[PDB]
Amino acid sequence: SALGKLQNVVNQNAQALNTLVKQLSSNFGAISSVLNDILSRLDKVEAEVQ
């Protein structure tokens, strides 16, 4: 428990990378968060809007 200063330098990078990775799952107002769904379901003129 003395080394908490060094273990926090590990933990803050683990939180930051996991948060940045998890944000790939968010919709942001699109029909899907998986880009290949948009490309397979929508034709080019509509797909750009998503």
Residues contributing to the site for other proteins (CB under 8 A): 31, 36, 39-46
Instruction: Give Rg (Cα) of the chain.
Output: 18
Closer residue to other proteins in complex, CB, 18/32: 32
User: Which is closer to other proteins, CB of 22 or CB of 44?
Assistant: 44
Quick one: tokens of 15?
Answer: 């939180």
- CA 8/CA 18 separation, integer angstroms: 15
Q: How near is the Cβ of 23 to other proteins at its closest, in Å?
A: 22
CA 22 to chain centre: 4
Report the residue number, 26 or 43, with the smaller CB distance to other proteins.
Answer: 43
